[PDB]
Every structure is written in C-alpha cells, then in structure tokens.
Nucleic acid binder design. Structure first.
Ligand SMILES: [Mg+2]
Ligand SMILES: [Mg+2]
Ligand SMILES: [Mg+2]
Ligand SMILES: [Mg+2]
Ligand SMILES: [Mg+2]
Ligand SMILES: [Mg+2]
Ligand SMILES: [Mg+2]
Ligand SMILES: [Mg+2]
Ligand SMILES: [Mg+2]
Ligand SMILES: [Mg+2]
Ligand SMILES: [Mg+2]
Ligand SMILES: [Mg+2]
Ligand SMILES: [Mg+2]
Ligand SMILES: [Mg+2]
Ligand SMILES: [Mg+2]
Ligand SMILES: [Mg+2]
Lengths: 141, 124, 55, 185
RNA sequence: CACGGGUGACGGGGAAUCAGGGUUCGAUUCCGGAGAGGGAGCCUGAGAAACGGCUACCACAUCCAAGGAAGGCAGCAGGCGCGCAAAUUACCCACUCCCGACCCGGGGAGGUAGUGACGAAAAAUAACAAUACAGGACUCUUUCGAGGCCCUGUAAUUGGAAUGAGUCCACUUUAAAUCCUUUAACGAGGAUCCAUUGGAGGGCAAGUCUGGUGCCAGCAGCCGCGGUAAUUCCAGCUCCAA
C-alpha cells in the first residue's frame, strides 16, 4: 500500500476495482465477451452431430496425422473440431450420428501437438467411447 | 427365563390408566411375542390380561434385552373410550372399514357434480 | 490420409492373459505390504534397488 | 419442508502431497503395527488429534483466569483422562500439545483385545471383534474402532453366547461332529 | 459518483475454502418479498386487487349437431419439449399440526415406503496351527556345520476351528407393511462366496524385463517419446497408489 490514512478507504477500495481489470483471468470471467465466444456456452459437455471426419497435421517437431471429427453442436449450431482420443477409435464414429463432447483439458486452450482444438469425444451414439476400446460394449445396431 | 421389569411407572387417573416402560430380559431367545407378556403383566399387576396394552418393542444389539412401553387400564369400557383405534384392532375390539382411500375421493367428486337427493344415488 | 487408423492395435500379436491366483484384499493386502517392506528385509550395500528392479 | 436433520460431517482429511516417501513409510508402520484396514483410518485419527490441539492452542493464547479458559480447559482435560490418552497426574492444558497419534491408536478396542491376551496377533483381534465374540460390560461390540474408556478397560471379555465363551459350538464343529456320527452310523 | 445502463441479481440467517487477513457461493426446507400464461378491472369478505374466485383483451388450446359451451399443474404424481443435467400416474391421516357447527369429518399439508454411487458415518473379502525353507538376535564352532530353549517372514503343502454375504420359520417393527434388531434350520477351500480404477522417463510412488511397430500408428495437462536394440505407443509379466 502507498496511501496510509485512516480516512482513505474509498481511495484504496476504488483502486482495487480499476486494477483488477488488468488481471487476465479476472478480465475474462467477469466480462460477457469470453462467455459468448465459448461454443459450449459455459457448459462442461455438449452433444452434436458429426459432419465429417478430418485429420490434421500435428506441429513442427512432431509428425503424425491427428484423427479428428468436425461436429456441429445442437444447442447452438456452431461447428467445432473434436479429437477422437484413443488409438483406432475413429472407426466407431461415422457421419451423421450424435456424440458427446467435452473440453480437452486446459479451459479453452489448445493442448499438445494438435493445432487449434479445444474439445474431445467421450461418447458416440450414447455408448461410452472407452467402453468400445475395451470391448465391454458394442455399437448399438 | 423370560423376566420382565417396569421402570418409570406412573398412574394418570385423568385418563384412567397406569403406564410404564417395560424392560424384558430374554437371553438367547427371539423377541418375546406381545401376547405372552400381557399375561406376565397381568400376573404382576393383579388384573385380567385383556385390559393390558403394550407397544414399541425394540431389541437391543446383542440380543438379551428389549425395552417397550406398556399401559394398564382400569376397565375395558374405559379402554375402548380413550384408545387409538389401531391399537384396539390388534386385540380385535375394533374393525376398520375396508374402503380404499383413493376410492373415497372420486366418490366425493362425483357427488359434487350432482345436486339434491340424487347425491345419494350417484354413489354406487 | 485417414486409411492407416488402428494400424498398430490390429497388427500387434494377441496374447491371452495367464491364469493367476487371486490377490488378498483390504487389511490382508496392507498386512502383506508391511511384511515385504519393513519387518522381513535387511539393509544392503550402498544404494538399494526398487521393488520391481530386474535385470 | 420436511422433518429431518441433514447435519453431517467428514471425519478425516487427505494430505496435500500425495507421493512423499517419508510420509508414506511412516503411516505404513501404524497401519501394520495396529492391523488397520486402509489409510483413511490413520487419517481420521490424525484429524481428531488435530482438533484437540487446535482447541488447546486457541485456549492457550487466551488470557488465563478467563472462565472459559478454565471451564473448557478442564472439560477438555477430563475427556482425555477418561479415555486414557493422558495420565491423571499430568493434566494441564499445555501438556496435551505433546501428544502422539499412537496414543489414540493404543486405546482402540482392537488393540486392547490383543493386550488383554484374548487374541494371538493384532490382526486376529480384529477378526474376533467383527465375528461378535467380544463384550464390554454385558454388551457385545461389533467394531474394532470402539475406543475404550479407562474405567471400562477392565470389563472386556468373551461374549456369553460364543463358542470361545460358554456357548454352543459353531457351524464347523457341529457339522463335522454330525458327519462324524453320520458317517460312522 | 447523482442520473443512465448491465447483472448468468429475490434479500437475509447462512455455505465452501481457509495461518493472520480474505476470496467465491446463497434457485434450495427458517424469516421476509413477489407471481400464478401476459396485462388490466373487480365481487364478497375483518382480511384479496385472490386466480384449485369472477369480467374483459392478447397468445395458446378443448368439445360441438357449426347454433354454443368450457380453460389455466411456478400444488402431488405423471407426460411432451428443452437440454451435459434431475425419482412412483404407490399406501395412510397412525405421528406433527391446521380447518370446521366439531372428542366423531377432512387435509398429495405432512407421514411411510419405491428409484437414488449428489454426498456423509460405520465396515467384510480371511484368522490360526503343523511341516518345508529363509533370515534374525543365542551357543558351540576358525568358518562351515549343528542344538533349539527364542523368534520373524514365505510357501494352489496339510489341518481342523470362527463367522457373515445369502436362502429363510417365527417374533418384533408398522395405520398396514418393509428395513434394522432378536432368533430356529441350511450357508466357505482354487473359503470360483474370484476388487476395482489409474499408472511405472521427470515433476511423482513404482522395470533401462520380454514380443510387436519403425517420426506410421499412437502417447503426452508441461517437459517431451516414436525415423530397426522405444524404460514413455500396442501387448504379456512384474511393481506402485487409493
Ligand atoms: Mg432474475
Ligand atoms: Mg435465496
Ligand atoms: Mg398474490
Ligand atoms: Mg406455465
Ligand atoms: Mg389476478
Ligand atoms: Mg392450479
Ligand atoms: Mg391458492
Ligand atoms: Mg443427477
Ligand atoms: Mg393426522
Ligand atoms: Mg380425523
Ligand atoms: Mg409433499
Ligand atoms: Mg468380492
Ligand atoms: Mg507398458
Ligand atoms: Mg510421473
Ligand atoms: Mg520415482
Ligand atoms: Mg507420465
């Protein structure tokens, strides 16, 4: 603190308000610009329909094709790119079916070598994607 | 082997009773049926067993003691006058109607539609 | 190219899991852990190796 | 609007660092030296002993000759003497800060059954208690974490309806004996 | 710091996290406000601008003989829709109270069960003995080797004992049940009555083990692994954590 009078509580308090807006994490949680930019709308999960199956290159030091899926959300109609996580799991996802998507780990930030994805697939056709990998359940036909 | 004792005995003559908490020691046996100890209270309190009312038996963890509540009546006619109807029915002195609660409600709402002496007709 | 999905998981060999005796659970498991680590063992020369050390 | 309580409480707390070798080995001694079942039993005893310390420390900072400095001081000390973690001649509320969690694990029913000699090992004692073979003043106790007050510590024996007491043989002996006579004729 | 705007704003008693300060939450059982699809206007009544009262207009919607009539679940269930996202169209006024002309009638208030891994407490999945062994303090012994008074652990070796999960007579419980508790009779050897979920390069506890792939497939919150001897991918064995 710089000012240290007994009757300076309005000065000190109204200076916190101004300087809290230069905090990046405070700035985005207390403005509506970040919330409206979120495809999920502030939810932890969202369901959408598969539009197409796509694969992206990774990044400069790595070299691999990241199996992804382009999905269109139901509550909004916004189109995002999700990453079918595990090895070979892309087979279980076909065009025009409903999947459950979740964040990819870092609160809307890109993760790892995949360039510019914020989302991941956890369930396809209302059956868990991890259960299909383990063979505990099969696709409902 | 079965021995009963009474605690917290107290006579309320404004309800013509005398009520107490009953402690039953039945080591090694299942919980004693109520009909069996209404005899034992009758022998203990010098009265006929049909005016004896007991309830609320809980057997402790371990299986040797059971604490319930009992209440003794001055006469059977007084007993029928001030007693819960469900507790007389356990002894047979009362029989409640076998009309379902739900059935009574739609019959109320049908009589409500009609007016006059035909209120009695619409019932069945 | 999307054609090479599931390549390794498919072309890897398939080995069945051998049958093995069940593992004790709860207090017995922690009882086994206590014996294998604290009351049975003896100090060794210099640095000690780990539980899963192998050559 | 319903008629019930909803008042509940957690009895433990997890440590902040999950993978400390020094801490892991220290609570593996206790879980094996007292035959406990998981780490959460150790954790809830550290947690209760931390309440006692937290109460005394805020009492110690209180100016002495305060009625609550004395009333809640004596009440706290009397409780610890009654369960036998603090011996009688040593009871003034600065002496409970120097107190270990092994003292509380001492007063468990499971530990006492071992030391009274009714069992063979600390693990065997826990088996008898669960299988309803122990009573405390004409009351069978079904749980090994029952904490024994100092006055009832001399009333621990086998239950009256127990094969280890004066009771019937269990299923195994009754069935083996019946087969023995059944097979003989 | 008026006025204006926004609020993903019903207020409070309170909740989570917490050294000392603080930060975030409070639709949610207690108190107070508001509202019954949206507005507006009234009757009766001590008390209403009432909606399980009435009258209009707007939206939606029901029956119809086409002339007309009727409507308000943000009550209890239940249904459609919305969605990441939330239970039975059950039994009873026996308890707690409230209403009435009333000791007697009524109460989806409220109580009791059903679904219920939101979450909180307790707490099984083995214990013991004997042999074979391996170590330890002991003795003799240069050691080795041996004596076991003493242990300690291990071994799909053998052995008898102890129980509850479950089936279920009854009692008890209860308005009637159910559950718990009590207690007969059955109920444990691979006691198959079989414990999972994540990891094993570092952070961070724990394999440079073996087979496969060859910058591919994949892993990786971060650093990074992978290009023909991969401790990091896919698997088996083993180990670690709860
Ligand atoms: Mg609002
Ligand atoms: Mg509120
Ligand atoms: Mg109103
Ligand atoms: Mg509505
Ligand atoms: Mg109105
Ligand atoms: Mg209504
Ligand atoms: Mg109303
Ligand atoms: Mg839910
Ligand atoms: Mg009632
Ligand atoms: Mg009535
Ligand atoms: Mg209700
Ligand atoms: Mg099991
Ligand atoms: Mg591996
Ligand atoms: Mg690590
Ligand atoms: Mg390590
Ligand atoms: Mg790692």
């Amino acid at each position: 603190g710089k000012c240290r009078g007994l009757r300076t509580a309005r000065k000190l308090r109204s200076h916190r308000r101004d300087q809290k807006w230069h905090d990046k994490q405070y700035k985005k949680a207390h403005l509506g610009t970040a919330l409206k930019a979120n495809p999920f709308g502030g939810a932890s999960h969202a369901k959408g329909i598969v539009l197409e199956k796509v694969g992206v290159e990774a990044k400069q030091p790595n070299s691999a094709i990241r199996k992804c899926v382009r999905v269109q959300l139901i509550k909004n109609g916004k189109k995002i790119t999700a990453f079918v996580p595990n090895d070979g799991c892309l087979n279980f996802i076909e065009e025009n079916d409903e999947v459950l998507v979740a964040g990819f780990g870092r609160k809307g930030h890109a993760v790892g070598d995949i360039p510019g994805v914020r989302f991941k697939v956890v369930k396809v056709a209302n059956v868990s994607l991890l259960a299909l990998y383990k063979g505990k359940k099969e696709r409902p036909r | 082997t079965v021995t009963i004792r009474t605690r917290k005995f107290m006579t309320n003559r404004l309800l013509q009773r005398k009520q107490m908490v009953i402690d039953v020691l039945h080591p090694g046996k299942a919980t004693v049926p109520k009909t069996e100890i209404r005899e034992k209270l009758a022998k203990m309190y010098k009265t006929t067993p049909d005016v004896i009312f007991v309830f609320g038996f809980r057997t402790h963890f371990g299986g040797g003691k059971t604490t319930g509540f009992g209440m003794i009546y001055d006469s059977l006619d007084y007993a029928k006058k001030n007693e819960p109807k469900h507790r007389l029915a356990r002894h047979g002195l009362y029989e409640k109607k076998k009309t379902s609660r739900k059935q009574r409600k739609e019959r109320k709402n049908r009589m409500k539609k009609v007016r006059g002496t035909a209120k009695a007709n619409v019932g069945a | 190219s999307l054609a090479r999905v599931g390549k390794v998981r498919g072309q890897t060999l398939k080995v069945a899991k051998q049958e093995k005796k069940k593992k004790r659970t709860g207090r017995a498991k922690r009882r086994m852990q206590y014996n294998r680590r604290f009351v049975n063992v003896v100090p060794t020369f210099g640095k000690k190796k780990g539980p899963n050390a192998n050559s | 609007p319903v008629a019930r309580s909803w008042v509940c409480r957690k009895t433990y707390v997890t440590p902040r660092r999950p993978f400390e070798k020094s801490r892991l080995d220290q609570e593996l001694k206790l879980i094996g030296e007292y035959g406990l079942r998981n780490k959460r039993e150790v954790w809830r005893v550290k947690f209760t002993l931390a309440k006692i310390r937290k109460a005394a420390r805020e009492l110690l900072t209180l100016d002495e000759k305060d009625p609550r400095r004395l009333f809640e001081g004596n009440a706290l000390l009397r409780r610890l003497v009654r369960i036998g973690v603090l011996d009688e001649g040593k009871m003034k509320l600065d002496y409970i800060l120097g107190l270990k969690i092994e003292d509380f694990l001492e007063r468990r029913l499971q530990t006492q059954v071992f030391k009274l000699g009714l069992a063979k090992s600390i693990h065997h004692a826990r088996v008898l208690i669960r299988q309803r073979h122990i009573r405390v003043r004409k009351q069978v106790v079904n749980i090994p974490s029952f904490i024994v007050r100092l006055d009832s510590q001399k009333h621990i024996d086998f239950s009256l309806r127990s094969p280890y007491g004066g009771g019937r043989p269990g299923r195994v002996k009754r069935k083996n004996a019946k087969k023995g006579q059944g097979g003989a004729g």
